[PDB]
Amino acid sequence: MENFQKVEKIGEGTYGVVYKARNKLTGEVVALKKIVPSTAIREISLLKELNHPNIVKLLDVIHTENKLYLVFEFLHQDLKKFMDASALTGIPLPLIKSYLFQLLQGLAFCHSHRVLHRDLKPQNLLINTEGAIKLADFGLARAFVVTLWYRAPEILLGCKYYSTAVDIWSLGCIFAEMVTRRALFPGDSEIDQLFRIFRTLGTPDEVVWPGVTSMPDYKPSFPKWARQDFSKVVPPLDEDGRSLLSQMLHYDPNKRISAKAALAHPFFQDVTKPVPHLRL
Ligand SMILES: NS(=O)(=O)c1ccc(NC(=O)c2n[nH]c3ccccc23)cc1
């Protein structure tokens, strides 16, 4: 590991501290994450082959002194900071739509390889100066302070075998947040998270989500809220954007739109790739 000089700490992630670091041989600047079960080693090693331009590149996996360091390509800014910096005027819709489109490409890729993220959130969506956005920490949750805001309702209801659909749900919540400049469901506990979802989208029932009532953490005592209309939930998003968001936020994970079908949605008919103006 001595092959790296830490330049600065970027922050505490779910799986360890992330450092900006410089390779002493190569000269390259990278993100260095200090995270050992052989099972974790093999899953992580699979992730090195999972290469896509909207997926932060895992450069190296350093198992040393019984410790695990992951070396990634480095990006200069995350979507949370960019959202914060954009909050006076909001992110312009064409850049929201570009970001959403690119992230759906990323998902479509990983999902087609049966790999899910499970913990999408603004802090692991990384952006560069060329107008790209990338998913960071893909596949780590499986290979191995906690924000709940982007958690799919089937996870909160105790489903142990959830699907790629959970990422679509997270990404729908992020889409909404870019548009409105506020978190869609900022729960501060699991029940607060669930009940915020219920209050906006309606308490789910057997009609809209067959099997919901048989889920591990479902309680017949849940209060029954009525669904709100999306026009009230994410103005001033147009009809195509609301329609797509609605399909990303379907309760039933089987009805929820796939990343691949989302890419064909009419919302993306006029998609472009703007460059943001970023201050590094
Ligand atoms: N807070 S901030 O906007 O200044 C900022 C946020 C994030 C990164 N960059 C990173 O954290 C980062 N780059 N590549 C990664 C690969 C995996 C995990 C994190 C990775 C830099 C700056």
Swiss-Prot record:
GO terms for biological process: cell division; cellular response to nitric oxide; cellular senescence; centriole replication; centrosome duplication; chromatin remodeling; DNA repair; DNA replication. CDD domains: STKc_CDK2_3. It catalyses: L-seryl-[protein] + ATP = O-phospho-L-seryl-[protein] + ADP + H(+); L-threonyl-[protein] + ATP = O-phospho-L-threonyl-[protein] + ADP + H(+). Binds 2 Mg(2+) ions. Disulfide bonds: none annotated. One of its GO terms (cellular component) is cytoplasm. Signal peptide: none annotated. The modification Phosphothreonine is found at residue 14. Serine/threonine-protein kinase involved in the control of the cell cycle; essential for meiosis, but dispensable for mitosis. Phosphorylates CABLES1, CTNNB1, CDK2AP2, ERCC6, NBN, USP37, p53/TP53, NPM1, CDK7, RB1, BRCA2, MYC, NPAT, EZH2. Triggers duplication of centrosomes and DNA. This is Cyclin-dependent kinase 2. It comes from Homo sapiens.
